[PDB]
Structure formats: structure tokens, C-alpha cells
Amino acid sequence: LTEMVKKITTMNRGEFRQITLTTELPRSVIEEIGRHKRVLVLIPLRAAAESVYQYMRQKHPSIAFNLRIGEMKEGDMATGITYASYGYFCQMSQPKLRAAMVEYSFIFLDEYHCATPEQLAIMGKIHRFSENLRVVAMTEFIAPEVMKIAGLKIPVEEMKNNMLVFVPTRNMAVEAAYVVVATNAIESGDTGLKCEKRIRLSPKMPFIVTGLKRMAVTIGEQAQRRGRVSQETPVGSKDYHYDLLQAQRYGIEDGINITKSFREMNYDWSLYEEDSLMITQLEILNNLLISEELPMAVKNIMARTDHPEPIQLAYNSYETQVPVLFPKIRNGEVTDTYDNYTFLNARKLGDDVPPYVYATEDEDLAVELLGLDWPDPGNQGTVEAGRALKQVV
């Protein structure tokens, strides 16, 4: 640790170090450079931030500690180690963010492999002035599958023991249901699977289609599941493309292309695996997103809706200002049920499909099932994004 600390503490501004082990490290660093110096530690979850803050301030009285998980503390100059969430810094404009960030001697990006939208936006954004910073990024039974519990062959003798069954979907957890069949959301408060959002990009409009997908859990997630006490191989790396798309919301007001910032940061810091074609397509779409000032009406809706992906509203506004209500899909069939989110003031699908730039898996499915067709780009900007996407392929 004294090696790591000596390497960190000799760092010049405009330098970067990636470390693999992560909380006694910032402590050693501050004790080395001076207790009145300022050092920032970025943590994904607010709960995780508060938890470290508490743990550290109790364990290390003599070292000042700060917590930033709420409202922007204007003119903040708290000496000691500051534990903040990436989301805290998401409230400030680029200039405010830079002014805030350069006031820290060291910046520790903890658990960067989570790749949350707040994390991805902050890393791309601060990398924009990385020359002014010193940043350090920090990071048994095999059951067979059943043929003609959760699709796995488990001995009946194990039912006499206390069981936790990890399952990917909400439906599977109830259908199979001491024995508790719980989703990954269980740990918050193994089938090797999980349900996460994924994205598909194409030159054909809607260029973006997002939806839940059953996938393999990561080695980290498998470790978390095993830590509570299938033949499915875990992924080394989580897919951050949805998250990167959601992260784009954080550059709208500043007119910053988050996708370009991510790509440029990652080229310098080499923190994530890259899918060049996907990043390129996401970047073309990102340029479109910020090509014009967002209509005030759309800004307000995005701010007030309970819609799960308000960025969809921002993208679609390049074609339509009226949100559409697609009939819900229960059991592979189109129902007469609708998902209505607040402030949209939407019209129902009917037989008139909206010129969506950004759609959901289910919105696409309803269109297909009904035998309808998605319109084509209606304007030069949208037509041009499409040609650019085709060219990139």
C-alpha cells in the first residue's frame, strides 16, 4: 500500500492512474500529502457513500470527512476527504463542475466497473479538463439444466435447508414460488441470469430501440450472489451501452456530446471494453440529440414525467411533439391496455404510427403485431443521421 501511495502522491496534475485491489488508500494519501488538503472519492450509490462516510469517520477520528449526496454545497472548500456520489456532481454545469473539481488535490473514481449513467457522464465530463486533475480509477456446486427449481436439477434433500433462488424475471420469481425466489433486486435491502436493458441501433428509423433482455450475470454479480451464504458462463464485462445512452441526458443543457466524451476519456484511461461501431452510432445519434435547443415544453415534460426513459422524449421531439400510447403486450398479443405516464398528454397508437427516432422493444412489437410500419426520416437532420448510420455500418 505504501508503494501505491508513493506512486499516487508523486502524480502531477494531468496524470491518471488505474488501481486494482480501496478506502484506506485515500486515507493513506491524505495522511501523506497533508490533512488540510482536499481529496474526493466518487461512489456510485448514495447509500454506499453515506456508509463509507460513517465507517471512515468513526474508524479515523483525526482525519476530517465530508459527505456530498444531497444539494449542491455552493463554494464548498471542506478540507479532509470528501465522499460524494457521481450523481451529486451531475447537478452542476460544466464550468461549475470544473471549478469544483480542480479544487481537489486528488480524485478517486471508485467502482468504475458499475458503469452507471451518472458515473459515465461524470467520467466523460471531468476528462474534458483531465489536464487539470490527478485522477485515480479504482476497482461451490454446478447444477445441471432440466430437459422434457428455476430450470435447474437440485436434490430434494436441499429443501430441508434455507434457500435463496436467484432468477432473472419478476414473473419467474412468482411462478416458481424457507425458500425465497428473488430477483437481483433482493440484495439491495443461482440461475446465472438477470434481466437488463439492452439497445439495438440501425439506419432504419426508429434508430434506437431499447428493451429488457435475459442475459448472463457478471463475475462480480456472481460473487455478490455467492457472497449471500448453472452451467451458464458469466461475462467478464457488463454491457454499458444502455447506461451510456441514458447518460446522454447529462450533456443536453451544456450542449456536450457525452458519447464523444466517453470515447475520448476511454481512449486515455482505458477503463472499458469498446464496441467501435456501437460507440460510433451512439455518437452520431448523440450529435442529433443536441443539434437544437430542446423545446421548453419537452424540457418540462422530461422534468415531470414518471416515464422510465425521458431521453426518449428528447430524441423523438426531432420528429414528433405528441407522445403516443402503444397498446400493452400481454402474452405475445396486443391488449387494449395502455401504459400512461404523467405529463405526456398522449394520443393512442390507433393505426397511425408515430415517426419515432427512439422506440421500446414493445412499441416495436405492437407495430409489427398490428401489421403496421414505422415512418421514415421526415427532416434533413433525421435523414442525415440515418445516412450517417448506414455509412458507418
UniProtKB/Swiss-Prot annotation:
Motif DEAH box: chain residues: 110-113
Subcellular location: Host cytoplasm
Residues listed as glycosylation sites in the UniProt record: N257, N340
Known catalytic reactions: Leu is conserved at position P1 for all four cleavage sites. Alanine is found at position P1' of the NS4A-NS4B cleavage site, whereas serine is found at position P1' of the NS3-NS4A, NS4B-NS5A and NS5A-NS5B cleavage sites; a ribonucleoside 5'-triphosphate + H2O = a ribonucleoside 5'-diphosphate + phosphate + H(+); ATP + H2O = ADP + phosphate + H(+)
Helicase C-terminal domain span: 151-302
Domain Helicase ATP-binding stretches: 8-143
Source taxon at top rank: Viruses
Function: Multifunctional protein that contains an N-terminal protease and a C-terminal helicase, playing essential roles in viral polyprotein processing and viral genome replication. The chymotrypsin-like serine protease activity utilizes NS4A as an essential cofactor and catalyzes the cleavage of the polyprotein leading to the release of NS4A, NS4B, NS5A, and NS5B. Plays a role in the inhibition of host NF-kappa-B activation by interacting with and inhibiting host TRAF6. Interacts with NS5B to enhance RNA-dependent RNA polymerase activity.
Subunit architecture: Interacts with host TRAF6; this interaction inhibits host NF-kappa-B pathway. Interacts with NS5B; this interaction enhances RNA-dependent RNA polymerase activity. Interacts with protein NS4A.
The name this protein goes by in its record: Serine protease NS3
Part of the full-length chain shown: 1795 to 2270 of 3898
